[PDB]
Structures are given as structure tokens and as C-alpha cells.
Amino acid sequence: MLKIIIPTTMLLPMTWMSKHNMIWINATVHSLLISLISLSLLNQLGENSLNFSLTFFSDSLSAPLLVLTTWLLPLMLMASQSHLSKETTTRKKLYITMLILLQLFLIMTFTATELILFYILFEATLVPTLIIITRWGNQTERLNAGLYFLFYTLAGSLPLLVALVYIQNTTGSLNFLIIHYWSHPLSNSWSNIFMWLACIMAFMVKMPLYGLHLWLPKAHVEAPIAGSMVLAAVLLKLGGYGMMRITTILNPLTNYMAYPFLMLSMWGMIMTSSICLRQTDLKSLIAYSSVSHMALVIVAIMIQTPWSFMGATALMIAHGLTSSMLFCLANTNYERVHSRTMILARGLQTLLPLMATWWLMASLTNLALPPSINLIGELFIITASFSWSNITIILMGMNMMITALYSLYMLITTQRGKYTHHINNIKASFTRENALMALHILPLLLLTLNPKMILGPLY
């Protein structure tokens, strides 16, 4: 891991001392180089996770998610040198400083060998993000969005902190391994129930949650594009990654005290998907779409089934790559039309042929048609839910309805139809935009050949 953590830090002195206009070029190429180094962690033994040292260890869950972060860093850097090149060098250099620091916390968080060690940097990702939304955002409501995002996740993080230190005072160290091997069946006492809520609400408030999803429309829509990918692609998985890591000392209390959360997520995703079917903002439709998929992940964890986790990891990384790509789609129009209303810029296939295509397989991948790992993600969860309860498919499949209508509805409204008459600013798609988007979908299709890597620790 030191083979990744140190190089990730080393970009920061380099970017801060690179030449005036070499900042993006130099940073991108080594950022791609680091992701190449991070590809080394895909190998996992048929047994205990790769434990490099007491400081850091990686399993078959962290490694697929880790590579997503490292592969991501070129994508924001390559998605941001168009809406920031008009700013001064120091502020541009500071933007790289936040992004590099944001990655470093993610790398350390996903690889933390100690539960409390996980907690610090997993929470510490707030500071680099909160700067991104509030400083470089491009709307007025970004400030209230920053408060909404920061406070909403902090309201759950603190009870987790009290819960984690309590487990320390009662069971000793919270090392992930010793926790797994030293497991005590949780009683149905009232205190254990409240301990269960503290150890869970911090992660469950973080993906979306139906009722706790109000920060995504504020944050994702108002965030800068480089940031906007991160609030939906990777940090939502931090709330995810915590769930499968923490749901090993809560069994069997999670067996019973999960119906209110399972019930909220199952019905909630139908509601929020229905929001997408009747949304006005392109980014908000994408963000609310991320809510429905992420709520599906929330459902998946709470049965504690080998098939459920097996498709849970695949769904998260598949969704994260897609949601980033769709947020690239919103950016492409946003530079030209300078507005986010959907019906403002209809008729893009006639004007931009390839960008229409890039919007095409992006929509199908969100459609979760086979064999794209979005399908292998959802379909695995369906069987796990179905075995848990047969009525689930009625609620399960009904989501597949709405996720079909709004996905093409976003496509049909924007790309197809007559082009907008009064616009005359749409130029040919920059090779940066097309190349970036190919670097999103192509590995996503390339992953389809062997999803054995992305399947997760249960496999």
C-alpha cells in the first residue's frame, strides 16, 4: 500500500511546483500512472485478505473500490481544465491540491486495518469536498448545499464515534480481523439496539437514504463537475463500504432491527425513481437516479446473504462509473447552453452525432441491460431479496419499470426531437470530452468480460 499511498502524496509537491501551464498535463499522466500501480491489488487469495501491515490491509472488497478511485483521478482532472483555465494558476493549483488530498483520504480509508482508523479519514473526506462545492461552485444555492451536505453526514458520524470507542472499551481493539474472529452474538437488549443504530445510521445516512437523501439534490447538482463525480461515484461507496465492514458485530440484531430501514429503502427507491420521471434539472435527474440505485445497495446489505453481498459490490462500482459518466453528460451541455433545464437544449443527435452516441450506451448502462455489470449487480440482488421474501420482486421489478422510463426519457428529451432553434453556440465536441467519456464506458464494458474481479469478498 505504501507503493500507492506515498506516490499519491508525492503529486501534491509536484503539482504545486510544476510549471505555469504544465499543471494539468504533468498531474494527469502520473495520476494515470498511479492508477496503473493501483491495478496491482486486483489479485486476492482464496483466503484471508492481503494484509500488508498493521497500518494497512486490502481485501477483495477494498481493491475493486480502490482502483475505481485511482482510475477516477484522471477523469476529474481531464474533466476540469475547461471551466477553470480562466482562473489564476494558484487557484487552479489549489484545485488539484483538494483533489489529490481527497484521493489520499479515500485510499487510506478503504485500506484501514483498524475500525477507528477507518473512521477518521472516512469522515475527514468532508474537508476537501466541502471546499470544492462551496468555493468553485457555479450557483447561489451552493452555500446552503454545503451546509446541507456537511451537517447531514456529521449528524450521524458522531454517534458512530461514540459507538466505536464504546466497543473499544468493551472488546479491546477494533481491528477488522480480530473483530471478525472475535464475534459476540448481539443480544436484543435495548442498549444493543441503540448501539446498532449508532453503528449503522452513520453509513446509511451517507448513500442516500429515503428521508436522509435531501442533501444529494443540493450537493450533486450545485457541486463543480470535478467534485460532482466524487459526491456520487466514490464517497457514496464510503457509506457503502462501512456497511459490509461494520455488519459483522451486529449480527443477529440486524436480523430484526432492519425492517424499518429495509422498508424505507424498498418503497423509497420507487418514490425517488418516480421523482426522476418528473424532474426538470438534468443533474437532479441523474442525482435522484443515483438515489434509487444506491437505495438498492442499502437493501442488499441488510439481508446478510452471500448472493446479496456478491452483487452489492458489483452494483456500487458499476453505478459509480455510470453516475460519473452521466455527470460528464450534464457538463457537456452545461458549457454550451449555460443552463441545466432539460427542455432548453433538445435535439442534440442532429447537431452532435457522437455525443449522442456517448449519451446512448451511457443510458443503456444505467438501464442495466445485460451483460453490463449494472444488470449483474441488480439481478443478483433480486435473487437474494426474492429468497428473503417473494413479494420483494413486486417492489424489486417495479423499480426496473421506472428506471427504464426516465432513463430513455432523459435521452429522448435531450438527444432526439427537433433541435432548439434559438441556440447557435453548440460547437463540435472537444476531443477532451469524447476521450474522457470513452475512458468511462470502455473499462465498464471491459469489466464485463471478467466480473470475477469486481464480485467482491464473498466470491
Partner 1 sequence: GWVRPDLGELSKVTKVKTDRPLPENPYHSRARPEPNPEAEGDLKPAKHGSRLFFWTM
Ligand X SMILES: CCCCCCCCCCCCCCCCCC(=O)OC[C@H](COP(=O)([O-])OCC[N+](C)(C)C)OC(=O)CCCCCCCCCCCCCCCCC
Binding partner of 168, given partner 1, ligand X, none, CB within 5-8 angstroms per partner class = partner 1
The closest alpha carbon to 244, from 457, 1, 25, belongs to 457
- CA 179, CA 165: separation in Å to the nearest integer? 14
Binding partner of 446, given partner 1, ligand X, none, CB within 5-8 angstroms per partner class = ligand X
Q: Which of residues 41-80 bind ligand X (CB under 6 A)?
A: 67-68, 71
The stretch among 174-182, 295-303, 388-396, 447-455 that binds ligand X (CB under 6 A) is: 447-455
The residues facing 50 across adjacent strands are: 58
Residue 389 lies near partner 1 (rule: CB under 8 A): no
- CA 459, CA 454: separation in Å to the nearest integer? 9
The stretch among 21-29, 205-213, 333-341, 442-450 that binds ligand X (CB under 6 A) is: 442-450
Residue 116 lies near partner 1 (rule: CB under 8 A): yes
- CA 258, CA 121: separation in Å to the nearest integer? 27
Binding partner of 7, given ligand X, partner 1, none, CB within 5-8 angstroms per partner class = none
Q: Which of residues 161-180 bind partner 1 (CB under 8 A)?
A: 168
Binding partner of 116, given partner 1, ligand X, none, CB within 5-8 angstroms per partner class = partner 1
Q: How far is CA 276 from CA 64, 207, 283, 290, 323, in A?
A: 29, 17, 10, 10, 14
Residue number with CB closer to ligand X (200 or 328): 328
Residue number with CB closer to ligand X (75 or 121): 75
The closest alpha carbon to 384, from 438, 313, 454, 291, belongs to 313
Work out the angle between the directed axes of helices 282-301 and 225-233 (0-180°, nearest 10). Answer: 20
Alpha helix positions (H), 18-112? 23-38, 62-78, 89-110
- CA 4, CA 408: separation in Å to the nearest integer? 40
| Per rule CB under 8 A, count of chain residues that contact partner 1 | 8
- Out of 17, 25, 54, 405, name the contact with partner 1 by CB under 8 A: 54
Residue number with CB closer to ligand X (233 or 282): 233
Burial of 287 (0-12, 13-18, 19+ CB in 10 A): buried
Q: Which of residues 258-317 bind ligand X (CB under 6 A)?
A: 317
Q: How far is the CB of 122 from partner 1 (least distance, A)?
A: 13
Q: Which helix (H) or strand (E) holds 61?
A: none
Residue number with CB closer to partner 1 (165 or 412): 165
Binding partner of 280, given partner 1, ligand X, none, CB within 5-8 angstroms per partner class = none
The stretch among 112-120, 197-205, 371-379, 425-433 that binds partner 1 (CB under 8 A) is: 112-120
The residues facing 281 across adjacent strands are: 341
Residue number with CB closer to partner 1 (120 or 193): 120
Q: How far is the CB of 444 from ligand X (least distance, A)?
A: 7
- CA 223, CA 132: separation in Å to the nearest integer? 7
Q: Coil, helix or strand for 457?
A: coil
Q: Coil, helix or strand for 144?
A: helix
- CA 277, CA 295: separation in Å to the nearest integer? 17
Residue 121 lies near partner 1 (rule: CB under 8 A): no
Residue number with CB closer to ligand X (68 or 325): 68
- Out of 4, 117, 326, 455, name the contact with partner 1 by CB under 8 A: 117
Check if the beta carbon of residue 303 is closer than 8 Å to that of residue 389: no
Q: Which of residues 178-237 bind ligand X (CB under 6 A)?
A: none
Q: How far is the CB of 116 from partner 1 (least distance, A)?
A: 5
Residue 131 lies near ligand X (rule: CB under 6 A): no
- Out of 55, 255, 383, 448, name the contact with partner 1 by CB under 8 A: 55
Q: Which helix (H) or strand (E) holds 455?
A: none
Residue number with CB closer to partner 1 (112 or 330): 112
- CA 195, CA 33: separation in Å to the nearest integer? 43
- CA 68, CA 1: separation in Å to the nearest integer? 15
Residue number with CB closer to ligand X (323 or 392): 323
- CA 404, CA 21: separation in Å to the nearest integer? 44
Residue number with CB closer to ligand X (59 or 222): 59
Residue number with CB closer to ligand X (66 or 352): 66
C-alpha cell at 425: 453556440
Q: Coil, helix or strand for 192?
A: helix
Residue 447 lies near ligand X (rule: CB under 6 A): yes
Residue number with CB closer to partner 1 (173 or 389): 173
Interface residues toward ligand X, by CB under 6 A = 67-68, 71, 317, 443, 446-447, 449-450
Interface residues toward partner 1, by CB under 8 A = 54-55, 112-114, 116-117, 168
